[PDB]
């Protein structure tokens, strides 16, 4: 009956809902074989939606297909209403496998920062045979990977033996933020998520605004709120795994020209990002606790929860 309220805040796509799923795996009722079947259709839909994005991007960016047969496949795939998708069959399976293989589409994917494409694309697209199998059953990892946008404010209680954690998940897009006031009361602690990999991206909500500039502005605002002066603040710099990949091809200095460290170096990059965040409130002497996280990594998230509970909240 001893109870603590913890907010998960952050801009859209930071990984807030993924944290909730991990709580469910580590401290809640987990995911049964039956639960996993409920995610099948979403997996399919994420795949179609991702390929449709790339297909429209091929035009917008003026990238030609390398193989002619792939145009017909793109016509086929573009005509699909993703809402009505419930199975993943040929000719759609082979069209998508075949599209994903075109060096054109691969350029388009490498240039994904210039449009909007969901983070788990590569993970699904490299594994279409597994997913296509007539009797495919999503793994726990497929479930952690799936994209479903959150709207509103939602409370998930979880019983850790000694204490109840009341975790609050929220929508992160601008329009959603006006509602946050509804969870700001009696907050023990805040877990603010930032996507390490969002440095070269722009917001979905708006026209050509940098996603990381947005997280900074938001973090700064939260930290200054006086009703949070006694709430502990934990900054999770999430998606550190995607950072490892992306840093090899997309240079941080091209987005944050103050970065004077080496190129193609994930560690220096993430230290610079961390530093930027910590430097937003020079007049506050309030503590920021941070950790680099990978929200889709259960072991990584298990640790991060034990440490908040064992160290920070006692």
């Amino acid at each position: 009956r001893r109870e603590l309220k913890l907010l998960l805040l952050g801009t859209g796509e930071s990984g807030k809902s993924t944290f909730i799923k991990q709580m469910r795996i580590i401290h809640g009722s987990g995911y049964s074989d039956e639960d996993k079947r409920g995610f099948t259709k979403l997996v399919y839909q994420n795949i179609f939606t991702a390929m449709q994005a790339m297909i429209r991007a091929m035009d917008t960016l003026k990238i030609p297909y390398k193989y002619e047969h792939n145009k017909a496949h793109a016509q086929l795939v573009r005509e699909v209403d993703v809402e009505k998708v419930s199975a993943f069959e040929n000719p759609y399976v082979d069209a998508i496998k075949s599209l994903w293989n075109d060096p054109g589409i691969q350029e388009c994917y490498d240039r994904r920062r210039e449009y909007q494409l969901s983070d788990s694309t590569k993970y699904y697209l490299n594994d279409l045979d597994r997913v296509a199998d007539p009797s495919y059953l999503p793994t726990q990892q497929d479930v952690l990977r799936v994209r479903v946008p959150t709207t509103g404010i939602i409370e998930y209680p979880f019983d850790l033996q000694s204490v109840i954690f009341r975790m609050v998940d929220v929508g992160g897009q601008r329009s959603e933020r006006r509602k946050w006031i509804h969870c700001f009361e009696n907050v023990t602690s805040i877990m603010f998520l930032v996507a390490l990999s969002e440095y070269d991206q722009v917001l979905v909500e708006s026209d050509n605004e940098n996603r990381m500039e947005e997280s900074k502005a938001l973090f700064r605002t939260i930290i200054t709120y006086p009703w949070f002066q006694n709430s502990s603040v934990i900054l999770f710099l999430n998606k550190k795994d995607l950072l490892e990949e992306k840093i090899m091809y997309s240079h941080l200095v091209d987005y944050f020209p103050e970065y004077d460290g080496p190129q193609r170096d994930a560690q220096a990059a993430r230290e610079f990002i961390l530093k930027m965040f910590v430097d937003l409130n020079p007049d506050s002497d309030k503590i920021i606790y941070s950790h680099f996280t990978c929200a889709t990594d259960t072991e990584n998230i298990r640790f991060v929860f034990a440490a908040v509970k064992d160290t920070i909240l006692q």
Binding site: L42, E83, Q116, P149, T151, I153, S175
Partner: protein, 134 residues
């Protein structure tokens, strides 16, 4: 004979699909109650306002009604702003300058989608819904 309980059946029907739920008057109402506890009822209000806007007969009424709906749900800083992307917002603004019955199809779709994949499944696992089954 085989017994089936009318309220058990009704509530079960709501779980067949979200479109089924939306055609059950008591489904809509249960779902709305739920949205309100998640502060996301503007999604359903917007959606309903579009279904109704599709019914309009007078062109005169159509024009100003499109403006009301946009000012109310779509524009940035709208009092009941729905979570949609920049493109859908802007496509809607373009549509607005020569308004028709399809003016909000794109936006109504995104919102439909939002509800369907996020709130609806959670509602089906809610205690409020589950209590109506046993």
């Amino acid at each position: 004979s085989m017994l089936k309980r009318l309220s058990t059946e009704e509530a079960t029907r709501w779980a067949d699909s979200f479109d089924v739920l939306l055609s059950h008057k008591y489904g809509v109402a249960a779902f709305r109650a739920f949205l309100k506890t998640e502060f996301s009822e503007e999604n359903l209000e917007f959606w309903l306002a579009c279904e109704e806007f599709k019914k309009t007969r007078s062109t005169a009424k159509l024009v100003s009604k499109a403006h009301r709906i946009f000012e109310e749900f779509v524009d940035v800083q709208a009092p009941r702003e729905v979570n949609i992307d920049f493109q859908t917002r802007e496509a809607t603004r373009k549509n607005l300058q020569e308004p028709s019955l399809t003016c909000f199809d794109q936006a109504q779709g995104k919102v439909h989608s939002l509800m369907e994949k996020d709130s609806y499944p959670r509602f089906l696992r809610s205690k409020m819904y589950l209590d109506l089954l046993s």
